[PDB]
Ligand binder design. Structure first.
Ligand code: CL
Ligand code: NI
Lengths: 211, 4
């Protein structure tokens, strides 16, 4: 069935989505979960939005990521205008035309993170670790808590994700490659990868590892 | 919400 959360709206705007929900017997929750089917985003005239946690978890889940205009237009035309026509196309960081959520909604038999062990390491801001972890799981990766907990062998491909910012140490994130044998990278590798829903390649995101 |  239909269950929604909204992102980047004002109370008045939210009151409109609620009005929408009421009419169409659609559920409306504060927090995105397994069940959540729609993510309603604030966008500019052309369906570009800002990047928010729900934005990512939305794409990651292959949910409908639709512009707020889906709501107000349906209201205005006293009916529900199928989501296909209002889907969000891009964002203020990853380009106005990348068709992110689209590829996602479509590529659910091939998660950009098939055969990956990812370990979100150290502190993050504005995004709790377990949420980043949930994200990459939805993308098919498998989470690993400790650097030393990486599966050994060849089967899989390990990766260490850090967000340099939230650090206060000077022997911290430069020395990860000493405690394990995995590529290191910034969170950006994940978000940008999730935005485009195209498995970006570590090249541009690697961090300097002291041997 | 926080943005990224
Ligand atoms: Cl916000
Ligand atoms: Ni390989």
């Amino acid at each position: 069935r239909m269950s929604m959360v909204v992102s980047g709206l004002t109370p008045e705007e939210f009151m409109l989505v609620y009005k929408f929900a009421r009419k169409h017997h659609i559920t409306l929750t504060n927090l995105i979960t397994e069940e959540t089917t729609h993510v309603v985003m604030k966008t500019d005239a052309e369906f570009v939005c800002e990047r928010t946690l729900k934005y990512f978890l939305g794409i990651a889940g292959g949910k409908w990521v639709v512009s707020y205009f889906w709501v107000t237009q349906s209201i205005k035309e006293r009916k529900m205008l199928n989501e296909h026509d209002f889907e969000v196309r891009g964002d203020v960081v990853n380009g106005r035309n990348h068709q992110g959520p689209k590829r996602a909604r479509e590529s659910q038999d091939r998660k950009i993170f098939r055969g990956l062990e990812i370990c979100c390491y150290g502190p993050f801001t504005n995004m709790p670790t377990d949420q980043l972890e949930w994200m990459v799981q939805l993308c098919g990766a498998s989470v690993v808590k400790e650097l030393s907990s990486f599966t050994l062998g060849t089967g899989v491909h390990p990766i260490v994700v850090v967000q340099p910012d939230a650090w206060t140490e000077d022997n911290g994130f430069h020395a990860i490659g000493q405690m394990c044998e995995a590529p290191v990278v910034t969170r950006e590798w994940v978000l940008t990868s999730v935005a485009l829903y195209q498995c970006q390649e570590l090249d541009t995101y690697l961090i300097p590892q002291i041997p | 919400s926080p943005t990224f």
